[PDB]
Enzyme design. Sequence first.
Site, PDB file in Angstrom:
ATOM      1  CB  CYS A  98      -0.996   0.011   1.157  1.00 42.04           C
ATOM      2  SG  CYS A  98      -2.135   1.424   1.152  1.00 42.04           S
ATOM      3  CE  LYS A 154     -12.563  -3.348   4.345  1.00 41.49           C
ATOM      4  NZ  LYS A 154     -13.377  -2.129   4.119  1.00 41.49           N
ATOM      5  CB  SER A 174      -1.283   8.323   4.413  1.00 37.26           C
ATOM      6  OG  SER A 174      -1.761   9.153   3.377  1.00 37.26           O
TER       7      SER A 174
HETATM    8  C1  LIG Z   1      -3.754   0.610   1.340  1.00 36.26           C
HETATM    9  C2  LIG Z   1      -4.119  -0.322   0.183  1.00 36.26           C
HETATM   10  C3  LIG Z   1      -3.957   0.393  -1.112  1.00 36.26           C
HETATM   11  O1  LIG Z   1      -4.522   1.432  -1.306  1.00 36.26           O
HETATM   12  N1  LIG Z   1      -3.093  -0.298  -2.037  1.00 36.26           N
HETATM   13  C4  LIG Z   1      -2.724   0.099  -3.304  1.00 36.26           C
HETATM   14  N2  LIG Z   1      -1.778  -0.484  -3.997  1.00 36.26           N
HETATM   15  C5  LIG Z   1      -1.467   0.275  -5.167  1.00 36.26           C
HETATM   16  C6  LIG Z   1      -0.402  -0.238  -6.049  1.00 36.26           C
HETATM   17  C7  LIG Z   1       0.547  -1.167  -5.541  1.00 36.26           C
HETATM   18  C8  LIG Z   1       1.603  -1.627  -6.330  1.00 36.26           C
HETATM   19  C9  LIG Z   1       1.730  -1.135  -7.614  1.00 36.26           C
HETATM   20 CL1  LIG Z   1       3.050  -1.707  -8.569  1.00 36.26          CL
HETATM   21  C10 LIG Z   1       0.827  -0.200  -8.144  1.00 36.26           C
HETATM   22  C11 LIG Z   1      -0.235   0.246  -7.353  1.00 36.26           C
HETATM   23  C12 LIG Z   1      -2.239   1.385  -5.326  1.00 36.26           C
HETATM   24  S1  LIG Z   1      -3.335   1.580  -4.039  1.00 36.26           S
END
Ligand SMILES: *CCC(=O)Nc1nc(-c2ccc(Cl)cc2)cs1
Lengths: 233, 233
Positions: free
Chosen positions: B27, B54, B81
């Site tokens: 995240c 969750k 955040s």
């Molecule tokens: C807090 C959970 C959350 O919003 N996770 C997310 N992960 C991404 C993400 C993660 C890895 C890559 Cl390579 C791209 C985008 C965006 S929001």
Amino acid sequence: ARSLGKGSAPPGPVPEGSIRIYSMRFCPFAERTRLVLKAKGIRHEVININLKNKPEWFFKKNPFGLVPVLENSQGQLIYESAITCEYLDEAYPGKKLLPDDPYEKACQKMILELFSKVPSLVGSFIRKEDYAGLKEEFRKEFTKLEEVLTNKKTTFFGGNSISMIDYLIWPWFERLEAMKLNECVDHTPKLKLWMAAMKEDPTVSALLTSEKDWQGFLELYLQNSPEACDYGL
Amino acid sequence: ARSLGKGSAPPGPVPEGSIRIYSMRFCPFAERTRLVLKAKGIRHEVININLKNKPEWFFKKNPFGLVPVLENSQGQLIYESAITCEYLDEAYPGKKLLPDDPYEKACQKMILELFSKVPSLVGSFIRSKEDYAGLKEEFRKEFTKLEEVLTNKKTTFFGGNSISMIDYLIWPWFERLEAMKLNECVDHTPKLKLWMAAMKEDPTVSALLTSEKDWQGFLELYLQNSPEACDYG
Ligand SMILES: *CCC(=O)Nc1nc(-c2ccc(Cl)cc2)cs1
Ligand SMILES: *CCC(=O)Nc1nc(-c2ccc(Cl)cc2)cs1
């Protein structure tokens, strides 16, 4: 008081020992900064901008083309209504509107997030058959704010005295009566009491607007008129 | 490190002189909070939450049901955040990541707003088409605004010639560009390409980095809406 639009001359430099606010007479966002300036007793000049007929030079003051905008003697520019309020509180003497404690300061900012949906809902209400859905959405949002006050067991969102968070959320509640949305706070007793407490505050009282001026501006807003922000004088 | 999901027991009390972060391993929002904790050398425990599964008790920690969430010995909870990152900087000793100067602090916050569109664009790109060409063009438009910042600043980082809070706040999205196959979106922004290279050289950024294999693994599972995605490894 009459707004500057396309073709108006840009203002001169800000005199030393003073700050400038680029405002809009009925704008709730710009009102936040105006409430802080009054509350902290800061010397300032107000320059009203017609956002529905923006002067070309205003783009240089803010890339987003929104009010409020603060400008000082050193030509430093500060935009985003919450950012200007924090700046003023930090940069000027007097009693601090924001609490010194990091956790309490965080709480105020967390309460501000719980309120974030109200300005957009207000906007949608101003812009057919779906007044009913928006009223139900307001109640849901107001319930969250009531839960804050209930748990806090205080009159204001930051204790038994007024603070920054109160001034930040106040302009939207100030417009409920004019928007004919008083029924949306019928299930929130502590929030109704808080609105009454706010109207008693000298800073809030000084910057208040009449129902006639509120209705006048709204009629022109509903007609998407550029002359709306110059309702009256 | 294994995430807690539905049916998992809520964790015990936070030991005195320590803080807890409710995170998610890939995240970008919780990475902000983790970058500050590392940078300021704060003692903390990490509890990974599976946001695609969750636990029921987690809604008591945050009404928005999102990570990051900070929890201390006194049971005080801090979410959002940006809010968590500012709290840590104010509440813990060491070098300040946010500048003491009110105007410079305001600038960091103003730059953060110029970035606000990027996280949502990234999200749309992950959840799917000819819509990929439109999103790439939207990224370029956004990145150009950030290039204008660096150009006017005439410094390496967004808050001076040294790394500060604002770099840590925007960095996680740029860290994922290579994995998302979006390196071409910074071709017209030379100063921003140089800034990304400077970030990778920072010890705090370096410590919290993720491999391309782990990035691709998580992404494949994220595109398949798998709950097991955040436990890739
Ligand atoms: C807090 C959970 C959350 O919003 N996770 C997310 N992960 C991404 C993400 C993660 C890895 C890559 Cl390579 C791209 C985008 C965006 S929001
Ligand atoms: C800064 C310009 C702007 O956003 N103006 C707005 N005015 C309102 C408004 C004003 C009066 C009443 Cl009664 C309701 C809503 C919302 S945004």
